[PDB]
Design a protein around this ligand. Structure first.
Ligand code: NO2
Ligand code: CU
Ligand code: CU
Length: 330
């Protein structure tokens, strides 16, 4: 030389713791882681897944820281586981982130460282090579955151714150188934891867868721818171885207993207985120119760898953518302 620281871580958702613102310164831281892977479961038924893561868871853791510172871481792976991982982151720168470096494988470880610167929330995440895505888616891653220183614121310135936171894451896833348808388962892882891848491619897823598962957150778991418170948330895723948312518530513030620186826105519702890344947112618450957271789409958330838851617491018122018446028838 520176110172350183360480831381712890925791787981888711938651975161850891821381612161925102411161014163112180720167530183470194550381952481560780581980891764784981496983498986788981897712848902318820059972378923488962495987896954992966870182620690364990888803898602892863977260871381935171611131711106400146640185861271460282370580891673581881274980071985046990197987695978490887690583881581991447976001944040850172280069390488890538770282991744390459870281790577690782198983066992181983590584460480780384870185720174941161920137712120816110962112895513880491795995991867590885080839594977990456696977990972891331597974798971993974877450876130870281850163823151610124011171714290937151618104637109114107013112310141713111818251319280718391948471975271968530888411895732997506894928697973596968076978033939018858268923778913597937495985055991281992590887086986697973292839287937887843295938578924993735386709893209779608399955588932988504947140954291892882478905548920987771828721118950127990778921988350928581218260018314017043515030818361923151964160878321894441890675891958894818887513968206876220928451428911019731818303946112317030935121951122988404997340870153822171720117411113934121416010118110828203838802947112977104994217995927990868993360974111954141814131818221617160018122018323118470428950718530838831977631895403919205628803378916995814518911168906797938894513878502968641938361718771818251317280018281119521019436015025616002019522019823017146119632229814018636016567
Ligand atoms: O896992 N890249 O944010
Ligand atoms: Cu992993
Ligand atoms: Cu990433």
């Amino acid at each position: 030389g520176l110172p350183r620281v360480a831381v712890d871580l925791v787981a888711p958702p938651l975161v850891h713791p821381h612161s925102q613102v411161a014163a112180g310164a720167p530183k470194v831281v550381q952481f560780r882681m581980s891764i784981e892977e496983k498986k788981m479961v897712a848902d318820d038924d059972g378923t488962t897944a495987q896954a992966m893561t870182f620690n364990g868871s888803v898602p892863g853791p977260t871381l935171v820281v611131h711106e400146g510172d640185y861271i460282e871481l370580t891673l581881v792976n274980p071985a046990t586981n197987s695978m490887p991982h690583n881581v991447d982151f976001h944040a850172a720168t280069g390488a890538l982130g770282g991744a390459g470096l870281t790577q690782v494988v198983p066992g181983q470880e590584a460480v780384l460282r870185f720174k941161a610167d920137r712120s816110g929330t962112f895513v880491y995440h795995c991867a590885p090579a080839g594977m990456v895505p696977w990972h891331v888616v597974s798971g993974m891653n877450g876130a870281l955151m850163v823151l610124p220183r011171d714290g937151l614121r618104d637109a114107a310135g013112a310141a713111l714150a818251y319280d718391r936171v948471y975271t968530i894451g888411e895732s997506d896833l894928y697973v596968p188934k076978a033939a018858d348808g268923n778913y597937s388962d495985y055991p281992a892882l590887a086986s697973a891867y292839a287937d887843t891848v295938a578924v993735m491619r386709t893209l779608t897823p399955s588932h988504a868721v947140f954291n892882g598962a478905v548920g987771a957150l828721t118950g127990a778991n778921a988350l928581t818171a218260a018314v017043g418170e515030s818361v923151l948330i964160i878321h894441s895723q890675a891958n894818r885207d887513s968206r876220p948312h928451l428911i019731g518530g818303h946112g317030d513030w935121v951122w988404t993207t997340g870153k822171f620186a720117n411113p934121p826105q416010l118110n828203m519702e838802t947112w977104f985120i994217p995927g990868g890344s993360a974111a954141a947112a814131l818221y617160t618450f018122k018323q118470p119760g428950t718530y838831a957271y977631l895403s919205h789409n628803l378916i995814e958330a518911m168906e797938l898953g894513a878502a968641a838851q938361a718771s818251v617491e317280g018281q119521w018122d019436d015025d616002l518302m019522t019823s017146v018446a119632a229814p018636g028838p016567a």
